[PDB]
Amino acid sequence: TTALVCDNGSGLVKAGFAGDDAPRAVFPSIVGRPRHQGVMVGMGQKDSYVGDEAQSKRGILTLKYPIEHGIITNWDDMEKIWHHTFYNELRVAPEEHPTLLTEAPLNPKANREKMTQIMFETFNVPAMYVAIQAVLSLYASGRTTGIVLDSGDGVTHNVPIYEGYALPHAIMRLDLAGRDLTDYLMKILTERGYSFVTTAEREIVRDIKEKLCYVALDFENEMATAASSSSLEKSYELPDGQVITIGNERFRCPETLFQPSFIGMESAGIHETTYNSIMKCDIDIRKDLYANNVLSGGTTMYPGIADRMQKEITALAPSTMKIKIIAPPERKYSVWIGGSILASLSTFQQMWISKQEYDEAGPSIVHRKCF
Amino acid sequence: MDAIKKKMQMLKLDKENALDRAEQAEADKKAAEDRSKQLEDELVSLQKKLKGTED
């Protein structure tokens, strides 16, 4: 039979059968209970709208993501999300399909063990396998080397790989991602008068960020230009009218990636953690990693980031090496495409964690040889 | 619109591939010509050594 390539993510759940080009169903991972009282009788009001249904009734819900930073903080809601994904968005019972979840690097063990225990006890799948979210993104590019920066919505991690041999001592995981950029944008919009507070209006700020923000090639020059002319002010229409005008908030929101001091984080930007991740590698594979830097994940879709990052790394790196940044147009679904490719391989067909194996060793089987 | 963006993306993929190939070929030419000229210098030094041996 065919395998189910699910990809929990944090912000958008992407799923679909193995062997295709794009995920079949992509929908936000939010579960929102209603918060008001409700007076109409017999309206058929449910107790929790999940997935894309709660992005249409969000006016009277309190949306809450079940995955904070890669890790899962609310297991009941995550179980509800998985149940919805299997039964309503794909309509395939899990009793007859292997599953291939994905997990960020350096995550707590208990999260992974609970994930496999749920998949084997509640949904009762035949066999499931957990894979690191960066190796898949490297599969999708058709490479076999390269250092991949997978800046998702929950957590940004940077896994270097050479000739198929991952370097476990050079993984640099940073917890700045799309959600913190949304919060920072929502916080700097208040400098013009627009106040978004409700958890429903966070979605509106996210839409503003997606449609308007861009990464500046040079930050100081843009700050000077936006403060003199008015060629940058782009307007946007809220879900009820009252258009708003975003000035130099456009390139200040995604600039947080390269200067995490804006949101008070100490660490260095995504332009310098990649160079540090490279320098921890051996001295003989640094040229190949320099030449095959891969971008993935949703948050790396800002217009103009593949040039800013290349300029920064070229500034840091030695002058002789060639710096090349692979930015495929299908960046958002790169991890899932790689997952489909991996699940479609014949050599991989014996790596699944078969159910009888789980019955013999318990949920701690995932840390064992079947990784 | 829709198809126009995809066509632009194709025209850009061609751009990147052609430019990268051009740069790589230029680097190859630089390396090969440096090799040849160093070999020629070695040949010259051998001629001079032969001259000293003849003397």
């Binding site: 080009d21 058709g142 490479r143 050599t347 040889k369 | 995809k6 194709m10």
Partner: protein, 77 residues
């Protein structure tokens, strides 16, 4: 110990052709076909239908004027 992947045979970077070159031409041609058929179905039919509705609207206007005038003529007392 870290997992040990059993040794296989092949391949990689050879499916990039079979997943890229396909849509490099088929997708462009199919989207061009879709745009052509949608424009043909939509624009000319919409303009013709709007002209037809405009003519019907003018006829309704004439009927309204005639009825209003005759009723005002009779009722004027």
């Amino acid at each position: 110990v870290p997992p040990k992947i059993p040794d296989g045979e092949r391949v990689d970077f050879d499916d990039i052709h079979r997943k890229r070159v396909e849509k490099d031409l088929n997708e462009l041609q199919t989207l061009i076909e879709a745009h052509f058929e949608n424009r043909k179905k939509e624009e000319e039919e919409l303009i013709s239908l709007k002209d037809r509705i405009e003519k019907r609207r003018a006829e309704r206007a004439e009927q309204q004027r005639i009825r209003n005038e005759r009723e005002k003529e009779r009722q004027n007392r």
